[PDB]
Structure formats: C-alpha cells, structure tokens
C-alpha cells in the first residue's frame, strides 16, 4: 500500500442472545427415612446400613453450597428512555419483564417429573418439609438461598447501565470508547433506534415460538430432571422401597441395591456440577467486563465491537442481551499527508485526508464522515517543498463576506 486507506462506511447495531446456566437444583436425601422407610425396625437397619447415608448426604450438601456460591458469584456483583424502546426489558409492576416471563414459562416446562411434583405437594408452605419427604421416598428439594424475588431485584439493580448522564450521552460516550465520534450517533439516532427496536422484536419472536437460542438451557434442565426421575424409576420399579410387606438376605439385597443407585446419582451429579461451575465462571466473566463496563475484547461479548449489554434472569440461568456495533461496506480511499495551498502546508487537526476520486475531504480514521476542508479543520506548519506526498487543493475559508 503506497497511498490508500480502508475506511468503513455503513454500520449496523445488533443485539445477540447469550444464555448461560448458572445454578443446579438442590437435592438432599433424608437419612433414617431412606433406610428403614416402613420396616418399623429402624435400630438394626440404621446400624449396619445407616452409616453410608450420611457420606452421600455430605456430598449433596457440598454441591448445594457450591451452586449457591455460583449464583452469588454471577448475580451479586453489585449491591443496591430516549428513542429506544426499553419497555420489554425493564421490570413492569410479579416484578419481572416481558422477556423474563417468556424465559420462565419456556424453561419451567423442561421439568415434568419429581421437581414439579414436589413443588405441587409443597403447597407454597416451607414448614411442611417433614411431610413432603414422607411420600416421595425421602428425597427433598431445598429452596435456594437467593429466591426468585431477590434474583429479580438484583437483575433490576444491575440494569442501571441504562441510566445522572442521559442515555443518548451514554451511547455517545460508548461510541467514543469504540473509536467513532459522537456526531455519528447524534446524526443517525433514528436509524439506530429503529435497528435496536427491530432487534428486540426479532429477539422476542425468536425466543418464544421457535426454541432457537433455548437449546443450551432447556436441555441441561431436562438432563437434571431426567437424572432425578431415573432415581425414582430405579427406586420404585426395581429394588423397591421398604413397605409393610431367615429373610435378612432379601432385605440386604434390597438395602444394598438402593444405596448403590444413590451413589450412582451422586457420582453423575458431581460431573454436572463441574460443568455448571465452568458455565458460571464464564457468566461471571461476561458480567464483569461486558456488563458494568465496555469491553476492549473483539468478538467475545458479541459479534463485532462490543457496545453494551443487558442482564436478564432466567430460571437456572442468565440471559445476556449483547448490543454490538458491526461495520460494513469498506471503501478504499486515496490518502495524502498534507495539502499545499498558497505556498503553505496544511496538516489535519484530527483525521486523515481522503479522496473519493474527484474531491478531497477530511474524515475520521475509523469512519467515513466527510467534512469539507476549511481553515478550522487544518493547521499550518512548514512550506510546500518539504512534504513528500503533497497534493494540490483549495482550503475554503469560512470568512467570505460581501
């Protein structure tokens, strides 16, 4: 390249969906009910066989506090409009938005077995946990430390990036962080608002009817529900629970088979907990530097240069709406360092001289906003003969009186 510069001309602001699971449901096995459920001889059953229940329940308590730590690391980073729409993404007073309830209604149908049955038999009363574990073979689902109300409140707190600076000035400052001046936003605000609103309309159409983006959240919750239902299936159809109905060998083969099924459940839940921890670490990284700050990385928060992001609280997950800036229609323009006029060399004050073929303009380096060459845009230093790649043009003085 001798004298040529590649400059973008058009731009598209686009939103993208990033769904990351951050929490697994809590399971706890109540001892002295899993073993000797209805044998009514719970001394000799809990002596030889009852010491292996607490070993598994310790691991379930460990993965439960690990998932609570995951939700605390993701959703609790902080403690506490214009031409854009923002009506479907903000809370509308049960303190949830219109993307949040679509996510909740689509993801809560991924479970249809043990968890929904426990929620139905709970009766919205937390004092019946001794009763609800009696009829479901001793398996209990603990509620999380951070409830749905607190997660929704923390999401509403983290949605303070839409703030005492007004929102168009914030978008202008984020464009200035990208590398384009504020005149591009303030002169193309209607097109940007239309693209953002149409992108929210497309995200609502593509999140609800088709699965589309909900293929990495529905399947992991479905895997968790199937792993819990297979425990009840292999606890009821074969190796059944102790009911009212020499024979120590039979009760030994019933109490050893039901323990091994639980050990299978813990062993294949620990790997799922590791995968959820990796996803939660990715979510904490994507909320530390895409939310609560513009990111300098490329193609990490979203496709193109990252501009903004909004968090949303999905059940057992987090939904990031990434707002990004995609350049398009690159053009090759002819560059020149300085311009000679009246025997005086003029250098650009802030920008690059460009030529589109016939006329000469002063533009920014990262965008094609043509400005006519005046004396308020160039400064004078040196003579004509010293600059190597000089070009002939006329600088237009704004003072042209009668």
């Amino acid at each position, epitope marked *: 390249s001798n004298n040529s510069i590649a400059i973008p001309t058009n731009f598209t602001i686009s939103v993208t969906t990033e769904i990351l699971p951050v929490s697994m449901t809590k399971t706890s096995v109540d001892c002295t009910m899993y073993i000797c459920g209805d044998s009514t001889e719970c001394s000799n059953l809990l002596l030889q066989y009852g010491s*292996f229940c607490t*070993q*598994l329940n*310790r*691991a379930l308590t*460990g*993965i439960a506090v*690990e998932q609570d730590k995951n939700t605390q690391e993701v959703f609790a980073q902080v403690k506490q409009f214009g031409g854009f729409n923002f009506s479907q993404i903000l809370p509308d007073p049960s303190k949830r938005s219109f993307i949040e309830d679509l996510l909740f209604n689509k993801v809560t149908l991924a479970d249809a077995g043990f968890i929904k049955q426990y929620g139905d038999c709970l009766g919205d009363i937390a004092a019946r946990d001794l009763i609800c574990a009696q009829k479901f073979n001793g398996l209990t689902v603990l509620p999380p430390l951070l409830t749905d109300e607190m997660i929704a409140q923390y999401t509403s707190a983290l949605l303070a990036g839409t703030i005492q600076i007004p929102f168009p000035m914030q978008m202008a400052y984020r464009f200035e962080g990208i590398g384009v001046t504020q005149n591009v936003l303030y002169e193309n605000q209607k097109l940007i608002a239309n693209q953002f609103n149409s992108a929210i309309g497309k995200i609502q159409d593509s999140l609800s009817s088709t699965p589309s983006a909900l293929g990495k959240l529905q*399947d992991v919750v479905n*895997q968790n529900a*199937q*792993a819990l239902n*297979f425990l009840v299936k292999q606890l009821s159809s074969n190796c059944g629970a102790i009911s009212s109905v020499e024979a120590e060998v039979q009760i030994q083969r019933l109490i*050893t*088979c039901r*323990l*091994q099924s639980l*050990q*299978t459940y*813990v*062993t*294949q839940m*620990l*790997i799922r*907990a*590791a*995968e959820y*921890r*990796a996803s939660a670490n990715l979510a904490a990284t994507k909320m530390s530097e895409c939310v609560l700050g513009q990111s300098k990385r490329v193609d990490f928060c979203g496709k193109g240069y990252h501009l903004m992001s909004f968090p949303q609280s999905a059940p057992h997950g987090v939904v990031f709406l990434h707002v990004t800036y995609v350049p398009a229609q690159e053009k090759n323009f002819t560059t020149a360092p300085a311009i000679c006029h009246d025997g005086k060399a003029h250098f650009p004050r802030e920008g690059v001289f460009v030529s589109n073929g016939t006329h000469w303009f002063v533009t920014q380096r990262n965008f094609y906003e043509p400005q006519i060459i005046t004396t308020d845009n160039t400064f004078v230093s040196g003579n004509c003969d010293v600059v190597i790649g000089i070009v002939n043009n006329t600088v237009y003085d704004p003072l042209q009186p009668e």
Partner: antibody
Amino acid sequence: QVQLRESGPGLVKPSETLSLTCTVSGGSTSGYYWSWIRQPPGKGLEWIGYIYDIGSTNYNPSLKSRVTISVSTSKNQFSLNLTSVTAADTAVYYCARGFDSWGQGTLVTVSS
Amino acid sequence: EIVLTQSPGTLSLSPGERATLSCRASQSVSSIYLAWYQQKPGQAPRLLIFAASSRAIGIPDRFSGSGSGTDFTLTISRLEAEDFAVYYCHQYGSSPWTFGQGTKVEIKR
C-alpha cells in the same frame, strides 16, 4: 449393578485407526456419563474423554484433534476412535461410567 | 491441566500401622472435586473416597479422606496384607481431568 466389558483390536499398525467398543450389560446408555481412560504400561493414568447420551462431548485438550467418541443406536454400546496412532499410544484402555464402576481393560499394542 | 503430585512414592509398612498419602495440586481445587483409587496388580481401579471424605459402598472404615485446597490426605488405619496396591488421586473438577503418579504400598514381614 452394571457390567462394563471392553472389546476391540489387540494390535494395529501405525497410521491406522482404533475402534474400541464397550458393551454395557445390566444397564442402558440413556442418562449417564461415560468415559474412556487409558494407561501406558508402568506409567500413570491419562484421560481421553467423556460423553453423555444426547450430547455434551468433552475431550482432552491435548488429544482433541484426533479423537471421537460416539454412542450407538443399540442403546447398549459406545465406541472410541483414534486417528494417526503413533507408537506412544499403546495402552490398557479402560471403559468407565463417569468416574465410578470401571471395567476391565483391553490392551492395544501399536507396532508394525 | 492441573498437575497432581504424590510425594511418598513408595512405602513399606508392617501390618497394623498407619499409611498417610498426600496428593498436592498446582491450583486450588475444591473439596468436592477429588477422588481416590486403588489398583491391584492386573485389575481395574476401584473408587475408594469420592469428594474429600465421602466413602463409597463396600469399603471398610479404614480408608479416610481429608483435606481442602492444595493438600489432600488419604489415611489407612489398621493396614492389612490385602492392601498391596497402587493408589491414585484424581480431579474431576476442571475440564482436563488429571490423575497422578501412584503411590505403591508394600507390606513388610
């Protein structure tokens, strides 16, 4: 209880492919994690990869470029294939369910 | 990869004594993402302690696990002659699962 039995070729030439199958008797490949873990003779254990029934294929990020693990439509088998097998890949391959209930190993020598 | 190193590479202990085996990780792994295995000569590995201290089913009260962070211990109390094995420590927390070089436990008579 579940039973894991491994089978496959005992000797392969270099620059060929392994095809090790693992028969699951007493259980089904429907909702559990399954992994392959190998061992050079007189050395430690090295982990190849684990899969789920519907998806989630995770392999080792030192052997990822030449490995594939796949379930079978018979609902009782899954297979491990390697590519560009050098002489340093001879091992006693082990078939496991997550990290519990391993199976007996199959020794795969690789020499011409 | 998180490299797991076992420092007492080979022991030689009489029956009735204790055996303390140490597994050390380069990075801080959690308490719930480590496991222990024993390997008899010419056999498959057998899970002994998953998580830090949770015993499996079919294992006596001799084998006890402890530790959190970058220092994990396996304790064998009242060792018998049927414990001639190679013992391995395993991480299933990070995506590249890493074992270690084993500890070979001998019996002295």
